[PDB]
Structures are given as C-alpha cells and as structure tokens.
Amino acid sequence: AKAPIRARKRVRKQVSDGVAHIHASFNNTIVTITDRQGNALGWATAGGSGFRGSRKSTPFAAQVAAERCADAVKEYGIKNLEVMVKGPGPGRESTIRALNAAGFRITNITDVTPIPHNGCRPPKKRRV
Amino acid sequence: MAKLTKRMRVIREKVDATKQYDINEAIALLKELATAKFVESVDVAVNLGIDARKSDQNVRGATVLPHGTGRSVRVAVFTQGANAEAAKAAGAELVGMEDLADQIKKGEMNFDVVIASPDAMRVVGQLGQVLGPRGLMPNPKVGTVTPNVAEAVKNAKAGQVRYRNDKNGIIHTTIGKVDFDADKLKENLEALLVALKKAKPTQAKGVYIKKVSISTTMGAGVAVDQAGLSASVN
RNA sequence: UGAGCCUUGAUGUGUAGGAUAGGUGGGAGGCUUUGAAGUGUGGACGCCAGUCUGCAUGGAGCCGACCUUGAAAUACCACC
Structure with missing residues (x-):
C-alpha cells in the first residue's frame, strides 16, 4: 500500500527531441x-533478450530490443524521435515499429548505411 | 517567532537607531518602544558561550529579586498531601493533585508557575524533557521541586524569577515592568547578575558572557554593550 | 567548493488539530494601507503546493491564560 513520500522534481537534461541509431549485423542488432x-x-540489445542461435538475428528479437531502450529514456525527458538506419540485417521495419509503439512519430527513416568504396575483406568462414 | 508584520513595522520606524548600547541608555530607549494597551513586561536575553550540555556545564536555578514584578507571578501548587489554607495563605491559587496532573498531561497549564513536590514530580514531570514555552512540567535543576513548598510559593509570588539554559547557553530572565524607574530596574538586573556568576561552572572562566540584549513584550529590544556592576543608574 | 563560528531572518507542512509541533523565558492579547487571508512578484520551504514573509492593492485573520485537538501547542516579542 501507499506511503507518505515527497514530491519528485528531477532533471537530467530535458532534451525533448532526439535521434536514434540502428546498427544491424548478421548475428545481432544493436539499438541506441x-x-x-x-x-x-x-x-x-536482442542478444541481451537471450534468444541466442539464429533466433538472435530476427525482426521480432530486434523489435523487443528497440522497446527496451525507448522505455528507459523517458527519464532523460525525451518526448519526440527521428531514426538513422545502418545495415542490411533483420529488423528492417520491425525495429522502427517498436520506437513507433514507444509513442513517437518516426517520419524520418534516413538510411545512412555506409557503402564503403569496397572496404576491408570479410572473413572466409568455413574452410571449404 | 518575531513575524514581520505592519504592527511591528510601526515600532521599527519610530526607533532612531540600532546599535549595541550602554545598559542605562538602552533601558531609557527600550521604554519609548513599548506600544501596547497592556503594561509590557521587561526581560533580558544573556547568551552564554558555555556548552549547555545537561546541568554541570549549564547555569540553571532561580533567585529572589529584591523588587517584584508588577505582575503577581501566577502560582499553583502540585503536591500529594498539603493543607490548602496554609499554602493559600502563602499565596497559592489552587492546591491539589488531580487538576495539575490533568493540565501537565493535557499539554496546556493555565498557571505560569507550578511549585511541585518531589512526590508530585514522580508520576508526571520526572520523564518530560521537551516541555515547550508555557513551561508546565517540573525540573529539580530550576529548584521548583522541593518538599518546602509554602516558602518557594510565597517567594514566587513576592519576586522570585528563574534562569535556565534551553539547548544553548542562552538565559532569559524577568527584570520588571516598563512602569518602573531606571534605578529600580538596574537593581533587579544586578541581582540576576550575581546569581548567573554564583552558578557559573569551575571550567567557565575564559569568555563567559558572549552577547547581551534586553527586550520588552509587544515592543522591540535594544542590544547591550554589557551588563555592568551597579544597582544604581547613577 | 564542504564545514565551523557568528549578526539578523525562516521552515518542521505530519497523525489528531483552523492551520504553521527547532529548544524555551517573558507572557493574557496586536489595529500604518483590519497582525490578516489571496491569485500575482522575490526569498525561506514541505512528511507538498502549502506555511511564514518584503509589497501595489486587500480591512475576509492569527490565536492564548480560555475557540479546540494533543505525547511536545501554537498569540506576540526575543533566541536562532
């Protein structure tokens, strides 16, 4: 039951508006x-939701990673969001949908995904 | 309290200047700064630089002024077994047990002083520590707790005034009415002063009196340079 | 940039209580724009927007020895 607690009044930075960044890889999604x-x-993250195996790199484990970060920043006093997308991995749309379910307008889905001018050689993986 | 209002403002306007003053010119200034239809009472605040810890490093007790206040000092008698006519002839208003044990439990006492027996103290007054400003519960340290009740009642009504510490070294004591002449007031002042020095601990021999200021009731106060040693204005 | 010391100035917002519980002497009340109270303005300030308070205006209130509730009881002047 209820206790006689003082009023809450705290400030952190009260930014009202933000940008979000989505780094999609082949094994995981990182949402920031x-x-x-x-x-x-x-x-x-989607790995910290503990799906593991192939199930760790899916639109649904990626969505719930987005709803986990988006909950925590109300205390920072953010009230609006815009999003930056960076990768070919899963959660193309599902990551977006979870910030939009956090109560934000997400009008600007700016793919900034870096296409190096053919970068550094990726790992061979299996020896056949 | 000393709440800042209109009725206080007028008093702060009519004064000529605030400074630490000579005791005789403070008393003659302070008498202009009464404002009331009631005849105001006059007392002194003496700040002592002592610890004020329980009793041993405190100054606590009472003295008989040579001249009494122009008030009666509204005396009750809290006791388990006395003759009512004998205490009343000494000056008491009411003698009993029950009515005074009710008041001090209730948290309002109609009397300004209760002279208490050790036997009265024992049930109600011996444990009480946080007794408020109407000063209902007993203390031994004050010396109001005596089996010789009728002597302390007659001496209270004639001119006995108290001195105590709070949680601090600060001594409030009654000096007279604004009715009175300057000398007669100095004479009461000086009687208190020998009493704060007689009670002074063996350790309190450095700086003792830190600050003096003298006060009237509804009127203001005037801060004091020092108390001095004279029972005459001149 | 902490703390102490010290001049003045102030809150204890609770639970019962109109509402406002720092230790306590004086002490039976104060009538400059009724001591008020009140949106508003600055400051103290909560166990929570409410107590004290500078003030154009506002004359509607505090509250005890005695409205009343209580274990500390309250005006108003001091000490802070």
Whole structure:
C-alpha cells in the first residue's frame, strides 16, 4: 500500500527531441537512443533478450530490443524521435515499429548505411 | 517567532537607531518602544558561550529579586498531601493533585508557575524533557521541586524569577515592568547578575558572557554593550 | 567548493488539530494601507503546493491564560 513520500522534481537534461541509431549485423542488432547534438541517452540489445542461435538475428528479437531502450529514456525527458538506419540485417521495419509503439512519430527513416568504396575483406568462414 | 508584520513595522520606524548600547541608555530607549494597551513586561536575553550540555556545564536555578514584578507571578501548587489554607495563605491559587496532573498531561497549564513536590514530580514531570514555552512540567535543576513548598510559593509570588539554559547557553530572565524607574530596574538586573556568576561552572572562566540584549513584550529590544556592576543608574 | 563560528531572518507542512509541533523565558492579547487571508512578484520551504514573509492593492485573520485537538501547542516579542 501507499506511503507518505515527497514530491519528485528531477532533471537530467530535458532534451525533448532526439535521434536514434540502428546498427544491424548478421548475428545481432544493436539499438541506441541519443540527443540530436549527439550524446547517448541509453541503449538495449536482442542478444541481451537471450534468444541466442539464429533466433538472435530476427525482426521480432530486434523489435523487443528497440522497446527496451525507448522505455528507459523517458527519464532523460525525451518526448519526440527521428531514426538513422545502418545495415542490411533483420529488423528492417520491425525495429522502427517498436520506437513507433514507444509513442513517437518516426517520419524520418534516413538510411545512412555506409557503402564503403569496397572496404576491408570479410572473413572466409568455413574452410571449404 | 518575531513575524514581520505592519504592527511591528510601526515600532521599527519610530526607533532612531540600532546599535549595541550602554545598559542605562538602552533601558531609557527600550521604554519609548513599548506600544501596547497592556503594561509590557521587561526581560533580558544573556547568551552564554558555555556548552549547555545537561546541568554541570549549564547555569540553571532561580533567585529572589529584591523588587517584584508588577505582575503577581501566577502560582499553583502540585503536591500529594498539603493543607490548602496554609499554602493559600502563602499565596497559592489552587492546591491539589488531580487538576495539575490533568493540565501537565493535557499539554496546556493555565498557571505560569507550578511549585511541585518531589512526590508530585514522580508520576508526571520526572520523564518530560521537551516541555515547550508555557513551561508546565517540573525540573529539580530550576529548584521548583522541593518538599518546602509554602516558602518557594510565597517567594514566587513576592519576586522570585528563574534562569535556565534551553539547548544553548542562552538565559532569559524577568527584570520588571516598563512602569518602573531606571534605578529600580538596574537593581533587579544586578541581582540576576550575581546569581548567573554564583552558578557559573569551575571550567567557565575564559569568555563567559558572549552577547547581551534586553527586550520588552509587544515592543522591540535594544542590544547591550554589557551588563555592568551597579544597582544604581547613577 | 564542504564545514565551523557568528549578526539578523525562516521552515518542521505530519497523525489528531483552523492551520504553521527547532529548544524555551517573558507572557493574557496586536489595529500604518483590519497582525490578516489571496491569485500575482522575490526569498525561506514541505512528511507538498502549502506555511511564514518584503509589497501595489486587500480591512475576509492569527490565536492564548480560555475557540479546540494533543505525547511536545501554537498569540506576540526575543533566541536562532
């Protein structure tokens, strides 16, 4: 039951608006909220949701990673979001849907996914 | 309390200046700064630089002023077995047990002083520590707790005034009415002063009196340079 | 940039209580724009927007020895 507690009044940075960054790889998704001038207000993951195996790199484990970070930043006092997408991995749309279920307008889905001018050689993987 | 209001403001306007003053010119200034239809009472705040810890490093007890206040000092008698006519002839208003044990439990006492027996103290007054400003519960340290009740009642009504510590070294004591002449007031002041020095601990021989200021009731106060040794204005 | 010391100035927002419980002497009340109270303005300040408070205006209130509730009881002047 209820206790006689003092009123809450605290401030952290009260940014009201942000950018989000989504790094999609082949084994996981990393999902990260920042201020628009560029400072991390929290992150979550799909690997920390504990699906493991192939199931760890799916649109649904990626979605629930997005809803985990988006919950935590209300305390920073963010109220609006915009999103940056960076990768070919799963959660193309499902990651977006979970920030939009956090109560944000997500009008700007700016793919910034870096296409190196043919970068560094990826791992061979299996020896056949 | 000393709440800042309109009725206080007028008093703060009519004064000529605030400074630490000579005791005789403070008393003659302070008498202009009464404002009331009631005749105000006059007392002194003396701040002592002592620890004020329980009793041993405190100054606590009472003295008889040579001249009494122009008030009666509203006396009750809290006891388990006395003759009512004999205490009343000494000056008491009410003698009993039950009515005074009710008041001090209730948390309002109609009397300004209760002279208490050790036997009265024992049930109600011996444990009480946080007794408020109407000063209902007994203390031994004050010396109001005596089996010789009728002597302390007659001496309370004639001119006995108290001195105590709070949680601090600060001594409040009654000096007279604004009715009174300057000398007669100095004479009461100086009687208190020998009493705070007689009670002073063996360790309190450095700086003792830190600050003096003298006060009237509804009117203001005037801060004091020192108390001095004279029972005459001149 | 902490803390102490010290001048003045103030809150204890609770649970019962109108509402406002730092230790306690004086002490039976104060009538400059009724001591008020009140949106508003600055400061103290909560166990929580409410107590004290500078003030154009506002004359509607505090509250005890005695409205009343209580284990500390409250005006108003001091000490802070």
